[PDB]
Design a protein around this ligand. Structure first.
Ligand SMILES: O=c1[nH]nc(-c2nc3ccccc3[nH]2)[nH]1
Length: 270
């Protein structure tokens, strides 16, 4: 209505119901929009985000609609702090979900999680949109057990230099290819690398990649051509898929379309 662009939500239309957790930018809550529609509401801590740049990008993000991408519904801009309003995912982040051993996952469920993520990423690739921080911690799980990719592209707006510098204490070293660690070369193929690490996280039930190494040791290990190895739950065929994401030469890594084909082949075979 009057006073609001298409990317803007009236915060008065929100009802807050439950605190979900705290992340990069602060508190996240579950609520309803206009009494009826489930939403997640992220309260963006002052000083954490490049807000004007994010708001301009929100206009682009609004148009990224795929069933396996967590939808951005809009932003509450008039105010301190700003809110980001997104699709509600009742079962929380994928990393925590994998780590709950009560689920007693079958490997067919693990492969389906990989396919969910791969479908989202194939869509993003088709739009020439890089995630830039793909990892289990950036995926969410809905009440049907469907995994969706969240926070795509958001790292571009983080003001904490510990996160954004490749030498920073909070940089995603363990999800980064050599050309990122060596020279900050981001590309479709750095998202591919990260996807392989995410498949490893899924098949490892949420272990930390390179869990016995520091970030510095990990960078050395991978720059020297060594890799993660096969999780016990991954078949040879699954391991081949995640390993293909880690070619030293970026141009030899598959696309998300090829990875999706490969995952579907294994689903049919196994
Ligand atoms: O953007 C979104 N949508 N949904 C969440 C969300 N759901 C959760 C459930 C439990 C814990 C933390 C959660 N965060 N974030």
């Amino acid at each position: 209505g009057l006073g609001y662009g298409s990317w803007e939500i009236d915060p008065k239309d929100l009802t807050f119901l439950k605190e979900l957790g705290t992340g990069q930018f602060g508190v996240v809550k579950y609520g309803k929009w206009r009494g009826q529609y489930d939403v997640a509401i992220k309260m963006i801590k002052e000083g954490s985000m490049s807000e004007d740049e994010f708001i301009e990008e929100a206009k682009v993000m609004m148009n990224l609609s795929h069933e396996k991408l967590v939808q951005l519904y809009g932003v509450c801009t008039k105010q301190r702090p700003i809110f980001i309003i997104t699709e509600y995912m009742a079962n929380g982040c994928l990393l925590n979900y994998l780590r709950e051993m009560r689920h007693r996952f079958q490997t067919q469920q693990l492969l389906e999680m990989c396919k969910d993520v791969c479908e989202a990423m194939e869509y993003l690739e088709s739009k020439q949109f890089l995630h830039r921080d793909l990892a289990a911690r950036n995926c969410l799980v809905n009440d049907q057990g469907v995994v969706k990719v969240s926070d795509f592209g958001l790292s571009r707006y983080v003001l904490d230099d510990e996160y954004t510098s490749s030498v920073g204490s909070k940089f995603p070293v363990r999800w980064s290819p050599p050309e990122v660690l060596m020279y900050s070369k981001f590309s479709s193929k750095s998202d591919i690398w990260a996807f392989g690490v995410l498949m490893w996280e899924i098949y490892s039930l949420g272990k930390m990649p390179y869990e016995r190494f520091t970030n510095s040791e990990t960078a050395e290990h991978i720059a020297q051509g060594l890799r993660l190895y096969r999780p016990h739950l991954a078949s040879e065929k699954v391991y081949t898929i995640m390993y293909s994401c880690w070619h030293e030469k970026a141009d030899e890594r598959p696309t998300f379309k090829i990875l999706l084909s490969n995952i579907l082949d294994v689903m049919d075979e196994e």
